[PDB]
A = this chain, B = another copy of it.
């Protein structure tokens, strides 16, 4: 019937925008009071131009940046359409990522869980397992009393570029033999399990196949280690069982605290038939 005018404070109530976001939009010339009373010299918003806030508010909401808010501003139906197909494209990445992290977190937990719900601790059992993909490298010379955390550098600067996470555990293998002394053993390999390219030759992506495994788990102590190994041996022996794998070792910290003492969780598997 006639044009209606509103003050910045009045537009802030109609639209649900702060009278601060309003000036910001005016200053970067995204939304400007279309009118200016010559007497007061104050600027008034026009009822007509409000419609323009609709786009600005939906875009802000989806976190769209400035220079795309101005770009989309001049797009008519068709273009503006492909504009969103481009937004649903960007939200997806954000979506697949969070959906990715989510798995690598439930995955990290299924493992912490088992550890916690161990049938018996420091005893031997035969449970079936599954294909645990692993990145491996050679533990040349390094043994159960030689390995360093830095021995697993390269292996971890990988699990990260795939999982972003580091490694749940520190793996290592060795031949199943009837050892008598600790210095009788040397690691064949050292590995870290993968949770999900340009892998260098000195490394091998492989796995810990599935089947029956004779495992024993216990919380570390510089002396339960060997004893527990032997007892796995013996168990396998007292059953006349056919071992078809190296011995798999998985150390994993109970906590990552500076205040307290080093505390690890050890588990040793051997695929038996």
Interface residues, chain A, CB within 8 Å of chain B?
1, 4, 6, 13-16, 31-32, 47-58, 61-62, 72-78, 80-81, 84-85, 87-88, 91-92, 94-95, 98-99, 101-102, 105-106, 108-109, 112-113, 115-116, 145-146, 148-150, 153, 156-157, 160, 164-167, 253-260, 262-263, 265
Contacts and interface: CB of A to CB of B under 8 A. Distances in A.
B52 A257 contact: yes
A101 to B, nearest CB: 6
**Which 9 A-B pairs give the minimum distances between C-beta atoms?**
A55-B256, A50-B149, A76-B255, A14-B153, A61-B164, A54-B166, A74-B257, A14-B150, A58-B165
A78 B4 contact: no
A115 B81 CA distance: 11
A36 to B, nearest CB: 15
14 contacts: A1-B145, A15-B156, A16-B160, A47-B148, A51-B262, A57-B165, A61-B101, A73-B259, A75-B255, A76-B255, A76-B263, A80-B255, A88-B106, A98-B98
Contact of A49 (B1, B91, B254, B258): B258
A105 to B, nearest CB: 5
* Dominant secondary structure of chain A at its interface with chain B: helix
Copies of this chain in the oligomer: 2
B115 A149 contact: no
A72 B106 CA distance: 17
A203 to B, nearest CB: 16
A88 B109 CA distance: 10
Given A48-B149, A51-B149, A58-B166, 6 more contacts: A51-B253, A51-B262, A61-B164, A76-B255, A88-B105, A95-B98
A81 B54 contact: no
B98 A91 contact: yes
Contacts of A53: 166
Nearest to A79: B255
Nearest to A256: B55
Nearest to A87: B105
Contacts of A50: 149-150
